[PDB]
Design a protein around this ligand. Structure first.
Ligand SMILES: [Zn+2]
Ligand SMILES: [Zn+2]
Lengths: 21, 29, 28, 21, 21, 29, 28, 21, 21, 28, 29, 21
């Protein structure tokens, strides 16, 4: 999920936006 | 472990800031 | 409104802690 | 919904749990 | 007590309830 | 150790929310 | 007043940092 | 106590030290 | 500066970019 | 002065997130 | 690296509180 | 660097002050 993805390596702002509605 | 728990706390702050009014999906499973 | 914006940032932190594995949607 | 209810008045953990998935 | 417990594993809110007040 | 130190900061925030008007005592000793 | 409730959250973080090993008195 | 003293006006670092053990 | 600009109306993350070095 | 203080705390966190490697300019 | 990223988020908060009106520069690399 | 000096061993608030403008 999101935690596995962004807490094992740093998500950039582009990668975080993937999660907005 | 706990460190994933502490990270997930900064993660949600960062999502809140990034997504503004849109809001975001947060279903950790 | 900034006051409402900073209040949402604390709400998202509290829900994170309260909801645990279940998560939550925050639209706002 | 939540902002209206929890930003103008203090919400407990119990009431915040209503907004969980 | 609390750091040993809650920093090596995740404490529930009800586990944290003990440490009030 | 920084990790325990960062963890203490999140614990104190979580206690603040759980304990409300009762307060709490945070001895890290 | 969520005003003071939000403030209080910044305050305990500040106390934790200032007091370090000593701990602190938090009886609102 | 501390919440009215320090959430009414900002407390300096020294004023915060008042509430350490 | 940034206080005047961003403490009464919300600054976007794109407006915050201006203060990056 | 309290609002200003609490807002500054959130701004510095947001600046950190957006500026990353580059750092930022901060003086209030 | 994530641990350094997390520590940085707390460092910035501590600096803000300690430095106050003076401000600080925070260039993490 | 501050990250190097403060991200493995804890910097006191007095060490942090060295980094204020
Ligand atoms: Zn943290
Ligand atoms: Zn706040």
């Amino acid at each position: 999920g999101i935690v596995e993805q962004c807490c094992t390596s740093i998500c950039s702002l582009y990668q975080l936006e993937n999660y907005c509605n | 472990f706990v460190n994933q728990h502490l990270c997930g706390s900064h993660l949600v702050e960062a999502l809140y800031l990034v997504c503004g009014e849109r809001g975001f999906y947060f279903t950790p499973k």
